[PDB]
Design a protein around this ligand. Structure first.
Ligand SMILES: CCCCCCCCCCCCCCCCCC(=O)OC[C@H](COP(=O)([O-])OCC(O)COP(=O)([O-])OC[C@@H](COC(=O)CCCCCCCCCCCCCCCCC)OC(=O)CCCCCCCCCCCCCCCCC)OC(=O)CCCCCCCCCCCCCCCCC
Ligand SMILES: CCCCCCCCCCCCCCCCCC(=O)OC[C@H](COP(=O)(O)OCCN)OC(=O)CCCCCCCCCCCCCCCCC
Ligand code: SF4
Ligand code: SF4
Ligand code: SF4
Ligand code: SF4
Ligand code: FES
Ligand SMILES: [K+]
Ligand SMILES: [Zn+2]
Lengths: 94, 95, 125, 263, 207, 114, 154, 114, 176
């Protein structure tokens, strides 16, 4: 930021970019190192009623695997064939 | 307070001190035995007992959520004070 | 094409264990006793194999518990007593097996607390 | 011959008459939650943690005390059952003190563990808690009675096992207190066992106080030599040092008790 | 759609179940079990003789096309007579799907090498041999890959101690690194953590 | 007792692979001493090789013998290709381990280990 | 890119060096840029997306020669796309809590731990015993920066 | 349609005559499938999917519109897959996976948790 | 969606072909690379003048450990052993017993700072904010033994650093 006008021009020309607009050294645009206190929100389970844990218990909904076959019609694939990708419209070729 | 053994070695707040004849004190020759000087047992005794007007008082150590879990202390016995089990502060029921 | 091998299973020479820790150790095969501090029985389901406790000593620098026993923390879990014994045999460990202890079935009756003429009458509730 | 058929979650099981719902669940390997019930003590039925639904019955029954009836289907995992456990756990913890970090029971506490498995994960209690004065019953058992959950196990053990009618409840209501009323010492040769059967840190071992935590101890199953009974024991050690002695269940010797000299 | 609970996907569960029995219909000689987990992962449990036929079929069949071997590993379960479970995790790019193939062996039974099916399996089988001691027949170059030269034992077995049996230091007398029996200044502190109260009734084993 | 073999159908075929490995190790010791610039003699090296084979002489299962041979060939290849360093080759001689007398009284004096 | 991309020395060192065919890359178990440099159209963020990758727009760079130079261009373009994703995350960041509101898995807030009995019990147990996980086995993978990173967790 | 300059996949060459190549390959697969037992599930399923692909090839003379129907990527990818299927079919003749399960596992082989 | 990184056909017209010949013969693209490093020569360097200047840190920074007190001077630690239980490295060792006034307090509290992974789990687990990771990171030693902290060392650290630690906790406790 303290570079003279001539030096700014020199490095701007050599690089071919306007380097002063996107300097890699940080100055006054950064956040202050002291901040006001936060006040974080609470989650969906912070209620005083209609909140029985048995109705929101993910761990107790897990079940043992479904036995499809054990040693105790059209052909199928594991899933539908993957759809072909599209070329980008933002920039198809780099 | 931090005392010294008859050998001169300081006694820690946990009562540790190498005895007269323990070779392990050679580790301090040319160096020093680290010993914290502020004994918490003596510091907490310095605090005055707090007089409250209820049978049950609560303590959280002070500072809100910077203290300890909030506990409730029964002050029905007059022969002694209620002591916080976390921070050691003492309470008594006035008359 | 399969082959016949009728000898007992002995893998002690291809496990890489030092000989001292094969022939001088004593495996204990047992079902852990319930922790009497709690009523839950979930830790008395499976068979355990542990080894004999060896010397622990105080570290001169810190006073920590030092050991020279590589098996001091080794505990294996087995579904049945037969599984544990078979594992001990093939690895060359001598072992003791302790039979499973199952709580006796008790006869409980709330009514007995108020017996007309028996000693089970309770003086307080 | 006289066995009757009952169902635990639809699974048939044949049980003798007089068997309680709780004992029927045991036969299929299901352990009903409990606090006041001890299989070696008289039935009390006061904690209500064992409440369980019977299919087609509109009222949950106390599993520890209710005899089974033929054809009953016990729903050990119904929403009706799960909600009963959550409600009781919520009441149990309403006045319980926030003592876990300083309480010796921490890590092997039935209240902690059953709150984890059967209770809710949060509190909605916005009041102040009860606080109770502690009571000196001798040099072996320390009492922190604000942790007591009034299960009366200690009273029943002292009366029935130890044959000492010194413990009881005084007052009533929320102010009901377990103790001796007067200043008395519970100095029986079996007194230390009440530390084991107290589900919470209300009764703890004075010699053991503050020295260890359950998860860090190594359990060596061994035998007592303080007398000729040969009581089976667990020697708890940590980092090369003996920390305490616990009973080990042996039905034909010491059941699940040890003497105070052994302990 | 309760906010803290992972949502189910029954469409994937149905598709994977149908393909599971499709594989069982085609390779009955080797397939012992087919299961789909509640989070939609398909596992084929096979006889060890079927490693090459089954893996070839999943790679090359037009309705399978599992071209990529994502992972190959082993698990040690001492309570089983065949203590080693061999697990193949395969990926199908064509059908955007994954499948797990599992078999078993014991300390003394060789498993056919799957390098012919997947060149990726080369180092995975060396790792399994190194860490578990399972021998793979017809491997082009089977030897330790992770352990030190001359290391004795197979560390990932459940009965191998955490800290092993030997440790290294520099010795001035012999002017080299030496190996000596392990001694620890502070022994590792075993913790007994399991709660004595059952956690998951849905998985309770019959008594 | 019908089990899949590794290499050898029976002990007769396995002992043939054992002898082949012993020859390979026996011929290799002179190179190992020379290449690693060890301060031991070829006689000590071959005595050590002999001691390693002898400890396993009591095996009767062909599958176990096959695995011992497989490991023996792996060990030999590590040595021939100088994947091992001098420290690895010398670990067979445990030169820094102090004597541990193996009689009851000597153990009794030093500690509790049986 | 000014230093390297069009530099003839850089191209001499990377162009046609280490060519891997699409078929070999698959059979050898390659992933990530090691597949996409050879023309394979695969990226787990697109095909098997996770936490909120299905809600952000980005392009997968694809190579045409499967050599070091094409893999270098793919990594350079992936950095640009990362910046593109980061921009959308900055704008679409939602409010709310940041761990699952279920104290049998995620520890309670410190203020709750110091006031509520249930919260203290759960804090105590989560930091000692830890949460139990239902029995099972999963292979889970992500599109890590270096390729497919997964765990087989039993 | 205009020829492909590249398939886009390193090492996958463009095919000048994809329709003819696919007809040859599917016809071969059906031929090899004729030596497999009629009731073997592999033959029934592979015949069904092979005949579907072959029908689509005959009914669509445009490669790009054929690629869309086949849903297997570039047409050169479909050809490679047809070649892989043929190789597998020859192998399954020698494996005979349609035979009954060679052996049941031990009692608790697949029981988890233990 | 995808994009091709390297799939472009150069123009074959006379001007383009002569532009490429000039680039080949006159090294234009190499000269352009020289311009970029030249522009950097005249930029202010990013170096800071350590130890007179310090790299920025935040209140959450995990550094050297310390044992804290209440404002009264009593120790916060009540020997619950949660930190010892959670420690991923088993770097914490604790012994405790009733103090002479009956308090629940430690007689040993060691942190092996060569085992520790400086993860901060211990300070998360502590229910009373007794054990923390302070902001100090300049405590390299000359011997290994100097990094085996016992309770006296950790209490001295707390007394030494409490002024900064308390201000850091104040800044971040509403995020915890
Ligand atoms: C052998 C060669 C050397 C012998 C000749 C020495 C000539 C005298 C050198 C004077 C340099 C002192 C700079 C100064 O005043 O300090 C400012 C500084 C305070 O200013 P500041 O706040 O830092 O602001 C700096 C600018 O804002 C930010 O800095 P800046 O980048 O904007 O620079 C400002 C100024 C600084 O430049 C100078 O003053 C000296 C220019 C001499 C150029 C010689 C080549 O340069 C200009 O303004 C541009 C004109 C200078 C010519 C630039 C041509 C570049 C080459 C062309 C590109 C292609 C190359 C092929 O004070 C100091 O730090 C004093 C330090 C003294 C260092 C020693 C200087 C003596 C060097 C050796 C002497 C010979 C022995
Ligand atoms: C009246 C009629 C007059 C008749 C006479 C007319 C003559 C003039 C017209 C002829 C052309 C004049 C220019 C000739 C210069 C030499 C050209 C040359 O050799 O460079 C081309 C060389 C080719 O290599 P490449 O690009 O990889 O591909 C070639 C494919 N076979 O590529 C290279 O050599 C690249 C070199 C790489 C290393 C460069 C590292 C330094 C770069 C910065 C140097 C800047 C120049 C400094 C000069 C300072 C001199 C004091
Ligand atoms: S009794 Fe149990 S729940 Fe109550 S404070 Fe003690 S450990 Fe915590
Ligand atoms: S002191 Fe313990 S055993 Fe006695 S009633 Fe209270 S909780 Fe139950
Ligand atoms: S920071 Fe982590 S590794 Fe270090 S002592 Fe604390 S919990 Fe242990
Ligand atoms: S530092 Fe905190 S977590 Fe560790 S033992 Fe002390 S009070 Fe418990
Ligand atoms: S266990 Fe049944 S009411 Fe207490
Ligand atoms: K108790
Ligand atoms: Zn307090």
């Amino acid at each position: 930021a303290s570079a003279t006008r001539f030096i700014q021009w020199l490095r701007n020309w050599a690089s071919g970019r306007d380097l002063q607009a996107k300097l890699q050294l940080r100055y006054q645009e950064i956040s202050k190192r002291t901040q006001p206190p936060p006040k974080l929100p609470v989650g969906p389970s912070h209620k005083l009623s209609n909140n029985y844990y048995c109705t929101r218990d993910g761990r107790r909904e897990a079940m043992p695997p479904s036995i499809v076959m054990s040693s105790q019609k059209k052909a199928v694939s594991p899933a539908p064939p993957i759809k072909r990708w599209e070329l980008s419209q933002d920039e198809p070729y780099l | 307070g931090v005392r010294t053994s008859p050998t001169g070695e300081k006694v820690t707040h946990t009562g540790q001190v190498y005895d007269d004849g323990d070779y392990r004190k050679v580790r301090f020759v040319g160096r020093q035995k680290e010993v914290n000087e502020n004994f918490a047992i003596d510091l907490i005794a310095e605090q005055p007992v707090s007089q409250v007007g209820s049978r049950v008082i609560s303590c959280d150590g002070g500072g809100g959520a910077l203290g300890h879990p909030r506990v409730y202390i029964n002050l029905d016995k007059e022969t002694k004070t209620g002591t916080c089990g976390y921070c050691g502060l003492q309470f008594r029921q006035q008359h | 094409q399969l082959i016949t091998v009728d000898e007992k299973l002995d893998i002690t020479t291809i496990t890489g264990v030092p000989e001292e820790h094969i022939k001088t150790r004593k495996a204990r095969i047992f079902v852990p006793a319930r922790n009497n501090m709690q009523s839950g029985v979930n830790n008395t389901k499976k068979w355990k194999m542990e080894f004999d406790t060896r010397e622990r000593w105080e570290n001169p620098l810190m006073g920590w518990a030092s050991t020279a026993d590589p098996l001091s923390n080794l505990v294996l879990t087995f579904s049945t007593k037969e599984d544990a014994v078979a594992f001990a045999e093939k690895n060359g460990w001598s072992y003791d097996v302790e039979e499973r202890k199952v709580p006796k079935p008790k006869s409980k009756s709330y009514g007995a607390n108020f017996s007309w003429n028996k000693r089970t009458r309770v003086s307080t509730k | 011959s006289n066995l009757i058929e009952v169902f635990v979650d639809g699974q048939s099981v044949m049980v003798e008459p007089g068997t309680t719902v709780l004992q029927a669940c045991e036969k299929v390997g299901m352990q009903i939650p409990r606090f006041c019930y001890h299989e070696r003590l008289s039935v009390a039925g006061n904690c209500r943690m064992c409440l369980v639904e019977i299919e087609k019955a509109p009222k949950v029954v106390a599993a520890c005390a209710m005899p089974v009836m033929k054809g009953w289907n016990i729903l050990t995992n119904s929403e009706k059952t799960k909600k009963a456990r959550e409600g009781v756990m919520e009441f149990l913890l309403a006045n319980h003190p926030l003592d876990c970090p300083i309480c010796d029971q921490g890590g092997e506490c039935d209240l902690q563990d059953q709150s984890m498995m059967f209770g809710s994960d949060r509190s909605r209690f916005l009041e102040g808690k009860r606080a109770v004065e502690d009571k000196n019953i001798g040099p072996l058992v320390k009492t922190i009675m604000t942790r007591c959950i009034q299960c009366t196990r200690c009273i029943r053990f002292a009366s029935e096992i130890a044959g000492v009618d010194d413990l009881g409840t005084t007052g009533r209501g929320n102010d009901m207190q377990v103790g001796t009323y007067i200043e008395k010492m519970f100095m029986s040769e079996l007194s230390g066992n009440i530390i084991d059967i107290c589900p919470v840190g209300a009764l703890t071992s004075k010699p053991y106080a503050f020295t260890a935590r359950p998860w860090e101890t190594r359990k060596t199953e061994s035998i007592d030599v303080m007398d000729a009974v040969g009581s089976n024991i667990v020697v708890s050690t940590r980092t090369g040092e003996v920390m305490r002695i616990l009973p080990r269940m042996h039905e034909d010797i010491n059941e699940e008790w040890i003497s105070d000299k052994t302990r | 759609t309760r906010p803290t609970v992972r949502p189910r996907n029954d469409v994937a569960h149905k598709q994977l179940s149908a393909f599971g029995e499709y594989v069982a219909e085609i390779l009955p000689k080797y397939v012992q079990q087919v299961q789909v987990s509640c989070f939609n992962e398909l596992e084929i449990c096979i006889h060890p003789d079927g490693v090459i036929p089954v893996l070839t079929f999943l790679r090359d069949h037009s309705n399978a096309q599992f071209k990529s071997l994502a992972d190959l590993t082993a698990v040690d379960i001492p309570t089983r007579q065949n203590r080693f479970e061999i697990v193949y995790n395969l990926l199908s790019l064509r059908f955007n799907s994954r499948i797990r193939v599992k078999t078993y062996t014991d300390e003394l039974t060789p498993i056919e090498s799957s390098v012919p099916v997947y060149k990726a399996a080369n180092w995975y089988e060396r790792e399994i041999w190194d860490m578990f001691g399972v021998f793979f027949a017809n491997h082009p170059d089977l030897r330790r890959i992770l352990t030190d030269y001359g290391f004795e034992g197979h560390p990932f077995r459940k009965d191998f101690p955490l800290s092993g049996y030997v440790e290294l230091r520099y010795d001035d007398e012999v002017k080299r690194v030496v190996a000596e029996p392990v001694e620890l200044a502070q022994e590792f502190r075993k913790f007994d953590l399991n709660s004595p109260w059952e956690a998951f009734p849905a998985y309770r084993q019959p008594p | 007792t019908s089990v899949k073999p590794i290499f050898s159908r029976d002990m007769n075929e396995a002992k043939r692979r054992v002898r082949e490995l012993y020859r390979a190790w026996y011929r290799e010791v002179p190179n190992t001493v020379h290449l690693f610039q060890l301060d031991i003699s070829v006689k000590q090296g071959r005595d050590k090789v002999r001691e390693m084979f002898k400890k396993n002489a009591h095996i009767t299962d062909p599958r176990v013998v096959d695995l011992l041979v497989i490991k023996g060939k792996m060990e030999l290849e590590e040595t021939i290709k100088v994947w091992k360093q001098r420290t690895h080759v010398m670990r067979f001689f445990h030169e820094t381990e102090a004597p541990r007398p193996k009689d009851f009284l000597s153990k009794f004096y030093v500690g509790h280990d049986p | 890119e000014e230093m390297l991309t069009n530099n003839r020395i850089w191209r001499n060192r990377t162009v046609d060096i280490g060519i891997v065919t699409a078929e070999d890359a698959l059979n050898y178990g390659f992933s990530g840029v090691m597949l996409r440099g050879s023309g394979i159209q695969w990226d787990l963020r697109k095909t098997q997306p996770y936490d909120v990758y299905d809600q952000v727009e980005f392009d997968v760079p694809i190579g045409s020669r499967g050599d070091c130079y094409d893999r270098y261009l793919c990594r350079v373009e992936e950095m640009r796309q990362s910046i593109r994703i980061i921009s959308q995350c900055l704008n679409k960041m939602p409010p709310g809590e940041i761990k699952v509101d279920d104290a049998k898995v995620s520890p309670p807030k410190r203020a709750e731990m110091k006031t509520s009995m249930e919260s203290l019990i759960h804090h105590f147990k989560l930091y000692t015993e830890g949460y139990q996980v239902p029995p099972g086995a999963t292979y889970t993978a992500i599109e890590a920066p270096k390729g497919e990173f997964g765990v087989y967790l039993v | 349609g205009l020829l492909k300059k590249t398939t886009g996949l390193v090492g996958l060459a463009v095919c000048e005559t994809p329709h003819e190549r696919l007809k040859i390959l599917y016809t071969k697969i059906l031929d090899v499938l004729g030596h497999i037992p009629k009731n073997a599930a592999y033959r029934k399923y592979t015949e069904q999917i092979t005949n579907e692909k072959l029908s689509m090839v005959k009914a669509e003379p445009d490669v790009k519109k054929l690629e869309e129907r086949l849903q297997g990527g570039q047409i050169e990818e479909v050809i490679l897959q047809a070649e892989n299927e043929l190789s597998l079919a020859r192998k399954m003749i020698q494996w005979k996976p349609w035979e009954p399960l060679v052996e049941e596992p031990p009692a608790s082989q697949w029981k988890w948790p233990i | 969606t995808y994009k091709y990184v390297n799939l472009r056909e150069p123009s074959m017209d006379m001007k383009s072909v002569t532009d490429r010949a000039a680039q080949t013969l006159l090294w234009t693209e190499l000269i352009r690379g020289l311009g970029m490093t030249l522009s950097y020569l005249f930029r202010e360097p990013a170096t800071i003048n350590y130890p007179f200047e310090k790299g920025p840190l935040s209140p959450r920074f995990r550094g050297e450990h310390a044992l804290r007190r209440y404002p009264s001077g009593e120790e916060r630690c009540i020997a619950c052993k949660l930190c010892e239980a959670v420690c991923p490295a088993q770097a914490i060792t604790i012994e405790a017993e009733p103090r002479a006034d009956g308090s629940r307090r430690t007689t040993r509290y060691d942190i092996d700072m060569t085992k520790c992974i400086y993860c901060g789990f211990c300070q998360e687990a502590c229910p009373v904010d007794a054990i923390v990771e302070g902001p100090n990171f300049e405590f390299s030693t000359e011997t290994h033994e100097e990094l085996l902290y016992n309770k006296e060392k950790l209490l001295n650290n707390g007394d030494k650093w409490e002024a900064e630690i308390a201000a850091n906790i104040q800044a971040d406790y509403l995020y915890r």
